[PDB]
Amino acid sequence: SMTSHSWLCDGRLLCLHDPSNKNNWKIFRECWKQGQPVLVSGVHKKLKSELWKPEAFSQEFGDQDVDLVNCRNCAIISDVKVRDFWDGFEIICKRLRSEDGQPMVLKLKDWPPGEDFRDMMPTRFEDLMENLPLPEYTKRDGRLNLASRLPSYFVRPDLGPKMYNAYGLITAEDRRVGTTNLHLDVSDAVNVMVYVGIPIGEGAHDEEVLKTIDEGDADEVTKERIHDHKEKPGALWHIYAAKDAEKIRELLRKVGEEQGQENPPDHDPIHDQSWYLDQTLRKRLYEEYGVQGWAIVQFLGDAVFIPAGAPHQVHNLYSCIKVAEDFVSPEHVKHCFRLT
Numbered sequence: 001s002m003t004s005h006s007w008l009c010d011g012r013l014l015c016l017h018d019p020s021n022k023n024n025w026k027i028f029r030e031c032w033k034q035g036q037p038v039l040v041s042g043v044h045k046k047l048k049s050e051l052w053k054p055e056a057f058s059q060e061f062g063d064q065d066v067d068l069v070n071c072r073n074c075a076i077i078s079d080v081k082v083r084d085f086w087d088g089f090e091i092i093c094k095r096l097r098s099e100d101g102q103p104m105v106l107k108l109k110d111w112p113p114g115e116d117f118r119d120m121m122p123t124r125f126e127d128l129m130e131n132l133p134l135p136e137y138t139k140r141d142g143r144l145n146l147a148s149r150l151p152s153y154f155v156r157p158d159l160g161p162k163m164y165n166a167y168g169l170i171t172a173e174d175r176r177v178g179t180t181n182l183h184l185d186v187s188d189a190v191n192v193m194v195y196v197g198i199p200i201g202e203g204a205h206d207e208e209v210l211k212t213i214d215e216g217d218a219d220e221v222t223k224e225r226i227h228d229h230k231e232k233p234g235a236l237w238h239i240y241a242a243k244d245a246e247k248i249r250e251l252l253r254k255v256g257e258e259q260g261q262e263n264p265p266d267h268d269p270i271h272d273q274s275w276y277l278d279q280t281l282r283k284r285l286y287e288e289y290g291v292q293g294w295a296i297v298q299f300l301g302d303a304v305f306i307p308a309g310a311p312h313q314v315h316n317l318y319s320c321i322k323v324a325e326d327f328v329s330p331e332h333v334k335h336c337f338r339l340t
């Protein structure tokens with residue numbers, strides 16, 4: 001039967017099933033006030049699927065100049081054409097190669113650039129903004145979005161949305177690498193998975209994806225979405241409560257020291273955006289500091305709600321197109337205040 005919601009992470013994560021249900025706020029606001037992330041499924045079914053394809057981005061915008069990042073070593077690939085990224089998104093035989101002659105796992109940096117999404121892609125902008133879930137929180141002018149209503153004593157988010165485009169991580173070695181390293185934002189955010197590209201050529205990399213989800217600490221109900229319903233998994237997230245941010249900083253200062261980094265005792269390893277918590281580091285966080293997080297698999301059309309101040313990291317399983325919008329909920333406005 002169709003139901004309003006279900007639970008993941010063994011009851012610790014709300015999963016809303018109908019993105020446009022006018023009663024979602026009633027269930028949402030109880031979990032959100034406690035500092036929890038929330039998942040909303042089915043957003044892909046609300047969108048115009050032809051506007052979110054890698055081949056369309058390449059055809060319409062392919063002559064723009066951009067920088068890429070090599071996800072394996074953080075090397076920057078400067079001043080290439082954006083088609084050089086899009087044409088290898090699913091076809092592995094078309095990817096830019098490293099010296100070792102392997103196809104690279106690439107992230108497209110800052111594209112569209114700064115606040116230019118709405119100017120560059122007005123039709124995509126409309127399709128996304130009109131179908132965001134929890135619209136009183138997430139729309140630019142929603143009644144529960146304080147972004148447009150706050151004085152300069154608060155850090156205000158940039159005008160969005162922002163697009164996040166990157167290939168999937170492939171190998172056993174890749175399991176310890178991030179697509180986006182551990183960091184935090186002083187605003188709330190909603191992150192929507194609008195396209196998942198399962199590649200071809202080196203296409204059969206399905207079994208390393210299962211070992212990554214399993215070692216990533218995903219719950220048994222999350223594993224049933226693949227095996228029983230054949231949904232497409234895009235990315236593995238780990239999210240931590242805002243109240244645990246300082247304990248994470250203490251762990252990363254101890255590890256930086258053990259690895260012979262030479263860091264002042266007060267430096268901020270979360271703001272530096274230099275760490276990915278692999279299986280070894282997640283277990284140490286739990287055992288040595290008492291900190292548990294949420295392991296979330298974001299499938300096609302899942303919207304991940306990330307609370308202000310909550311540390312988080314992202315590991316692409318397959319090639320992903322994500323679009324995210326920032327907002328300022330009244331529950332979490334304390335995180336962007338500039339005093340005490």
Ligand SMILES: CN1C(=S)S[C@@H](NO)C1(C)C
Nearest residue numbers: 006015017041221225229
């Ligand atoms: C989030 N979620 C479950 S858990 S099962 C899956 N149906 O395949 C649905 C209802 C979308």
Ligand SMILES: [Cl-]
Nearest residue numbers: 035242309332
């Ligand atoms: Cl909070």
Ligand SMILES: [Cl-]
Nearest residue numbers: 121122123124
């Ligand atoms: Cl457009």
Ligand SMILES: [Cl-]
Nearest residue numbers: 025134135136
């Ligand atoms: Cl709402």
Ligand SMILES: [Cl-]
Nearest residue numbers: 179180181273
């Ligand atoms: Cl990063």
Ligand SMILES: [Mn+2]
Nearest residue numbers: 183184185312
């Ligand atoms: Mn973020």
